Amino acid sequence: MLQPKRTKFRKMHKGRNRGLAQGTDVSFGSFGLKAVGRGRLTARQIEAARRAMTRAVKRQGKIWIRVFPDKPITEKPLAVRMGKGKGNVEYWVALIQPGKVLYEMDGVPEELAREAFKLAAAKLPIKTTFVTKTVM
């Protein structure tokens, strides 16, 4: 799930992770989960965190997923020898940099938001924090 429908090329290079994140601030909603840390979030992890928050807020308020898994992470099978091409495309991840806000939410109070975001934070591998909207 949460895989792009059309992709220009099937497999993509492994790459390295960027230094920091753009998209730090909360703009869609009042309350947010901002990652403090570097990592890869899988699509199953993103789905699990969103499911945790929506069960917590009980279909009240709106949840925004501000990240999307566009990175094809490819894995070779068991008992296969090295070489003989790249591996077949097994899952879709999103590279998370420090400072990236990943989830926004509105229409719930601050304590409900903080509980929902901590239940997401347990699911995600990266370390995260609660952030709130500010005026500039």
Partner: peptide, 11 residues
Amino acid sequence: KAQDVQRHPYK
């Protein structure tokens, strides 16, 4: 007056 704010990313 305050015009633009640059904040630390994860702090």
